[PDB]
Amino acid sequence: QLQLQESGPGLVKPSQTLSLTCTVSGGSISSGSYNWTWIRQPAGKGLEWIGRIYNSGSTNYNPSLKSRVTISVDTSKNQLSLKVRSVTAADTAVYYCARHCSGGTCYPKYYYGMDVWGQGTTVTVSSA
Amino acid sequence: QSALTQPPSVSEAPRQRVTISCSGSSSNIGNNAVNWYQQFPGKAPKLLIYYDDLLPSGVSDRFSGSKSGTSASLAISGVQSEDEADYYCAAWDDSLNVVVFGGGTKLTVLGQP
Amino acid sequence: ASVYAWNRKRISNCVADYSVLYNSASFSTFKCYGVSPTKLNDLCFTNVYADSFVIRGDEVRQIAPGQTGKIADYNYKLPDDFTGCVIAWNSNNLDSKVGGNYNYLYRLFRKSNLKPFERDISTEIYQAGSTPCNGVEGFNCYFPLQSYGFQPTNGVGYQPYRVVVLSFELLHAPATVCGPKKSTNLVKNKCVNFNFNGLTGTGVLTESNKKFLPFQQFGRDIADTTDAVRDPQTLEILDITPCSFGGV
Amino acid sequence: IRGWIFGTTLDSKTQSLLIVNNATNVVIKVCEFQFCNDPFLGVNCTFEYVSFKNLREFVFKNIDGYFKIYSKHTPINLVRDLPQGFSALEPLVDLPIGINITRFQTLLALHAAYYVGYLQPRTFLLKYNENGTITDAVDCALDPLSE
Ligand SMILES: *[C@@H]1O[C@H](CO)[C@@H](O[C@@H]2O[C@H](CO)[C@@H](O[C@@H]3O[C@H](CO[C@H]4O[C@H](CO)[C@@H](O)[C@H](O)[C@@H]4O)[C@@H](O)[C@H](O[C@H]4O[C@H](CO)[C@@H](O)[C@H](O)[C@@H]4O)[C@@H]3O)[C@H](O)[C@H]2NC(C)=O)[C@H](O)[C@H]1NC(C)=O
Ligand SMILES: *[C@@H]1O[C@H](CO)[C@@H](O[C@@H]2O[C@H](CO)[C@@H](O)[C@H](O)[C@H]2NC(C)=O)[C@H](O)[C@H]1NC(C)=O
Ligand SMILES: *[C@@H]1O[C@H](CO)[C@@H](O)[C@H](O)[C@H]1NC(C)=O
Ligand SMILES: *[C@@H]1O[C@H](CO)[C@@H](O)[C@H](O)[C@H]1NC(C)=O
Ligand SMILES: *[C@@H]1O[C@H](CO)[C@@H](O)[C@H](O)[C@H]1NC(C)=O
Ligand SMILES: *[C@@H]1O[C@H](CO)[C@@H](O)[C@H](O)[C@H]1NC(C)=O
C-alpha cells in the first residue's frame, strides 16, 4: 500500500514560480535506498527527467533546467515538493513524481527501476 | 534528451511477436542499465522491464527485455488487446547526467474489429 | 549448479563416446565452435572439460564466443578462440517449483568482466556509488547475486535451461581422450586390407600356432616385415601372408 | 619396500607419481601429495588406479612424456648381493603423464636393499629364443669382442 499523492494548482502564471507537492502514503518517505525524482511530460510528447533528491537533502537536476528548479523533502509532512521558477509556455506538461531505487534496502528489490509513480498533476502555464 | 530513439508506432496481428528496439549511445545504454515503462492513455507510466531484462511481479511473462551493445529491445510474444499502450525505454546518460527517455512506441494490435 | 558457480568436470583417461549426443534428440540447443560434431569421434584431445550450469532461454544465446550480457560478462565467459560445443535443453519440468524455484542464482553486478573460463563466487557488496560499502548494503551497495524466478507458467525465454559446455584442449602433451571406433568382422583365408591397432597392410589372415607373450602385440620376420598380429578382441594369433603375386 | 615416489620437489607444489602396493592392492596416483619430511609406511589429481627370496627389478624412463615401467619377478636365494645372471624385463604399464621427473625416492615399511642405475644410449644385440623371450644380450660397447 505504497501510494504517492500529487497536489498543486492547475494554472500557474508565466514568469512566476510553480509549486507542486508529492505526498507519500503507506510508509515513510525517508526509509529505503530511493532516489525521489520528478518527471514532466508535455501532452503528446515524451517524458522529461527534471531532477532528483536523495540521502538527506543532496540533489541533482537536469542541466538544461538546473538553475530554475528546486526539489525539497519535508520529512515531518512525509512529502517531497517541486519548485519551478520563472516558468514559460514551454513548461506546460503533465508532471509526475516517482521513486528510483539505488540500493539493497528496497522492497521490492527492483534495482534501477522507478518503482511507484504518482497519478500526475496537469500544469498549464498561461495567464488566462 | 532524445538520446534514446524508438519507432513511433509498431503494429502486428494478434498472437504474433513484436520487437520494440531502443537505440542509444555508449554514454547511456552502453554503460548503464536500461529500464522499460508502459504508459496507457490518460495514466502514469508503469514499470514494465527493469535493469535491462528483469520482470516485476504482476507483469505478464509475455514481456521480455534484451540488450546488446548500445541498443536494447523489448519483445512481447503473444500480442493482445490488453497490450495497446505507449512503451518508453529509459537509461542514465553519463554525458548528460540525466535519465534519458525514448520517444515512445505505440503498440496497436491489428486484429481489432 | 548456478551459472555464477558453474561446475566443471574433468574428463581424462577414457574413450569418449559422443553417441549420447547424437542419439539423444532431447536437446534444444546444439552449437559447436572450432570443431565439428561429426568429425569428433575420430579425434584426440589432451583433456576435455565439461562445464554445467542453469540459465533461462533468453540467456542460452549468450553461451558463445564473442557474446555480451550478464551471463557472458559476469557469470560464464568463453574465449574468442573457444573450441568446443554448447548443448542446452529445456529443463522446466525439473528446475521449476509451483512457488518458484529460487535455488539457482546468478551474478548481477561486478566491477569488471570475467576472464575466459573464470568462476567468481565472491559475495562482496558491490559499490556502485561514491560511498564505500563496508560489507553492508544500502545506497549504491547491492548484493552481487540475484535469484532466478523459475515457475511452470513462465515464458519460454524465462524457463530454466540446463547447459553443458564441452571444451577441447590440445597441448604439447599426450592425448588420453580420443574417441571410440567401430570394428568390423574378421575374414580369414581371403586377401583383405587389415588395420590392427592402427597398423595397416594387405595380406591373407590365417590361424597360427605362434605363442605370443601377453605383452607382445605384433610379430616380425628377418626382413622386419609384419609376420603376425594378435586380434585385439579375441586373444588369438593370426598369421599375415601377403596376397598371392608373381608373373605371367 | 612397498612403493616409489617420482617428481621434482615432492612437497605438494608439483605433480608427483606415487605407487603404493599394500598387501594385495597396487595403488598408483599422480596427485600433488604433501609428503612427510621422511616418507615411510608403518606396519588436483589427474589419474588414479587401484588393482632374500624375491628379486623385483624395475626400469623407469620418460620418452616424449610417456612414463614406461618394466619389471620382472623371479625367485632367488641370496641375501648378500644381486644374483648373477640374465633376465629380461617385460613392459607392464605406460602412463602418458607428460611430467618432468628429475628426482625419486623409495618407500620402506617400518615396524631390504635396493640398487639405482642409469640408462645410456647404448646399442644392444638382443637374442630372442623360439618363444620370443630374450635370453642373452651383447652390449656393443663393452669391449672389442662385444663390438
Ligand atoms: C541515485 O542518486 C545517486 C546520487 O546522484 C546516484 O549515485 C551515483 O551513481 C553514479 C553512477 O552509478 C556514481 O558514479 C560512479 O561512482 C564511482 C566513484 O567512486 C570513486 O571513489 C571510490 C572511493 O571513494 C572508489 O572506490 C571508486 O573506484 C571511484 O574512485 C566511479 O567508480 C564510477 O566510475 C566512473 O569512473 C571511471 C574511471 O574511474 C569510468 O571509467 C567509469 O566509466 C565511470 O565514469 C562513477 O564515477 C556516483 O559516484 C554516485 N554518487 C553518489 C553520491 O553515490 C545513483 O546512481 C542514483 N541511482 C539511480 C537508480 O538513479
Ligand atoms: C618440462 O621440461 C621442458 C624442457 O625443459 C619444458 O619445456 C620448456 O618450456 C618453456 C615454456 O613452456 C620454454 O621456454 C623452454 O624453452 C622449454 N624447454 C626447452 C628445452 O625447449 C616444459 O615446459 C617442462 N614442463 C613443465 C610442466 O614444467
Ligand atoms: C571382449 O571380447 C572377449 C571375447 O569374447 C570377451 O571375452 C571379453 O570379455 C570382452 N570384453 C569385455 C569388457 O567384456
Ligand atoms: C592401500 O593404499 C590406498 C592408497 O592410499 C588406500 O586407499 C588403501 O586403503 C590401502 N589399503 C588397501 C588394503 O588397499
Ligand atoms: C593442477 O595440475 C595441473 C597440471 O597439469 C595444473 O595445470 C593446474 O593448474 C593445477 N591446478 C591447481 C588448482 O593446482
Ligand atoms: C616355449 O614354451 C613351451 C611351452 O609353452 C616349452 O615347452 C618350450 O621349451 C619353450 N621354449 C624354450 C626355448 O624354452
Numbering used by the authors:
A (entry chain H): 1 to 128
B (entry chain L): 1 to 113
C (entry chain C): 348 to 595
D (entry chain A): 101 to 143, 165 to 172, 186 to 245, 263 to 298
Study text:
S from both SARS-CoV-2 and SARS-CoV-1 uses angiotensin-converting enzyme 2 (ACE2) as the cell surface receptor (Hoffmann et al., 2020, Li, 2015), ACE2 is expressed in a number of tissues, including epithelial cells of the upper and lower respiratory tracts.
Antibody 88 binds to the back of the neck whereas 316 binds to the top of the neck, orientated radically differently, however, the H3s of the two Fabs overlap well. Passive transfer of mAb 40 or 88, but not an isotype control mAb (hE16), prevented SARS-CoV-2-induced weight loss. In the lung homogenates of antibody 40- and 88-treated animals, no infectious virus was detected at 7 dpi, whereas substantial amounts were present in animals treated with the isotype control mAb.
